[PDB]
Curated annotation (Swiss-Prot), chains A, B:
There is a cross-link at K83 (Glycyl lysine isopeptide (Lys-Gly) (interchain with G-Cter in ubiquitin)). Belongs to the STING family. GO terms for molecular function: 2',3'-cyclic GMP-AMP binding; cyclic-di-GMP binding; DNA-binding transcription factor binding; identical protein binding; protein homodimerization activity; protein kinase binding; protein serine/threonine kinase binding; proton channel activity. Changing T110A: Strong decrease in c-di-GMP-binding. This is Stimulator of interferon genes protein. Ubiquitously expressed. Expressed in skin endothelial cells, alveolar type 2 pneumocytes, bronchial epithelium and alveolar macrophages. Homotetramer; in presence of cyclic nucleotide (c-di-GMP or cGAMP), forms tetramers and higher-order oligomers through side-by-side packing. Interacts (when phosphorylated) with IRF3; following activation and phosphorylation on the pLxIS motif by TBK1, recruits IRF3. Interacts with RIGI, MAVS and SSR2. Interacts with RNF5 and TRIM56. Interacts with TBK1; when homodimer, leading to subsequent production of IFN-beta. Residues 1-177 are annotated as: Cyclic dinucleotide-binding domain (CBD). GO terms for biological process: activation of innate immune response; antiviral innate immune response; autophagosome assembly; cellular response to exogenous dsRNA; cellular response to interferon-beta; cGAS/STING signaling pathway; cytoplasmic pattern recognition receptor signaling pathway; defense response to virus. 3',3'-c-di-GMP binds at S9, Y14, R85, V86, Y87, S88, T110. It comes from Homo sapiens (Human). Changing R85A: Abolished cGAMP-binding. Abolished ability to induce autophagy. GO terms for cellular component: autophagosome; autophagosome membrane; ciliary basal body; cilium; cytoplasmic vesicle membrane; cytosol; endoplasmic reticulum membrane; endoplasmic reticulum-Golgi intermediate compartment membrane.
Length: 177, 177
């Protein structure tokens, strides 16, 4: 299925490559680049999974209580003929009552953008019903993979359907640690 | 199908983003960073499509007459919550009789790595026969998409099955311009 390929590619070409190196990048940030006076960046990669596949490129567009703070040091690797391909991730603060309530590495699962665009291009032969069905199946397959992935406590999938506060959704997952 | 999703994601999340900006990056390279005395980098993105999905990360491993030269200036974009996600491409020289016969931006289609890894992981339920069939279907769907893609003369798909000279394969496509 469409979702089966996208979930395996998200693992093979991304999570399995960056998750083993993420803990070290966060520590390096927390000790060398973070503000001396502010809270540490939390430890896991938080992955947003809107089942409606609405993926703005700016998180502050989805919720103004999610605001960009800084970048981790980037990770590079030679990949499929590209020397020093760059993997970069962004740190966000999460506001509650106008005060910072959390700091974490946060991003949307980019394959949901593919599902959305496929539902929009007639040549893809892919309906909005297909989109919802495959979005769900993508999340479930990714869950399946990560349950047995040796690359373990390194990320958190935040699946949701849409008075909805995305920042409150992330905070609920954050505060479970 | 698996290949249908991977081909649409390769277009939507990569080719359609970098191909409109590639001509300008090559010109900037040719005028500012290229050796003053050497040939210009050719104009299109050459994409290698081994149907056996064997995708080494170092092209010099597939053919010693393909050797890394330099990187284009990188392209950055805000993407799905990642500030300044980096798109980078690498320039290769192509040797014939130990002399340089061409200079071009060259890389493997990374989704073929996903197909290969899926054939190797039992949890993917994906056979080596599936791999060949979907590799072919991935290439054909990508061909279909690009035939009508407004983002036109900007890349060249090099599909091949494996006394085979990869550098000679690329040169044949290069010299058709
Ligand atoms: N958040 C995030 N940051 C990343 O760096 C990243 N890289 C991949 N992904 C997703 O992982 C999966 C596997 O990536 P793969 O490289 O095999 O396919 C990629 C790859 O073949 C190509 N591509 C995209 N960006 C680049 C890039 N910088 N360099 C080379 N190829 C790229 O186009 C495909 C789809 O890209 P994305 O649509 O962004 O989603 C991918 C995909 O779902 C990423 N997701």
């Amino acid at each position: 299925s469409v979702a089966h390929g996208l979930a395996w590619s998200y693992y093979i070409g991304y999570l399995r490559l960056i998750l083993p190196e993420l803990q070290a990048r966060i520590r390096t940030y927390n000790q060398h680049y973070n503000n001396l006076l502010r809270g540490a960046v939390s430890q896991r990669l938080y992955i947003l999974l809107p089942l409606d596949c609405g993926v703005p490129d700016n998180l502050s567009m989805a919720d103004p209580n999610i605001r960009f703070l800084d970048k981790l040091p980037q990770q590079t690797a030679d990949r499929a003929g590209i020397k020093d391909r760059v993997y970069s991730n962004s740190i966000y603060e999460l506001l509650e009552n106008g005060q910072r309530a959390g700091t974490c590495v946060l991003e949307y699962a980019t394959p949901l953008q593919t599902l959305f665009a496929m539902s929009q291009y007639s040549q893809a032969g892919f309906s909005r019903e297909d989109r919802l069905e495959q979005a769900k199946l993508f999340c479930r397959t990714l869950e399946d993979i990560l349950a047995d992935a040796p690359e373990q406590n390194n990320c958190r999938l935040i699946a949701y359907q849409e008075s909805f506060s995305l920042s409150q959704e992330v905070l609920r997952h954050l505060r479970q640690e």
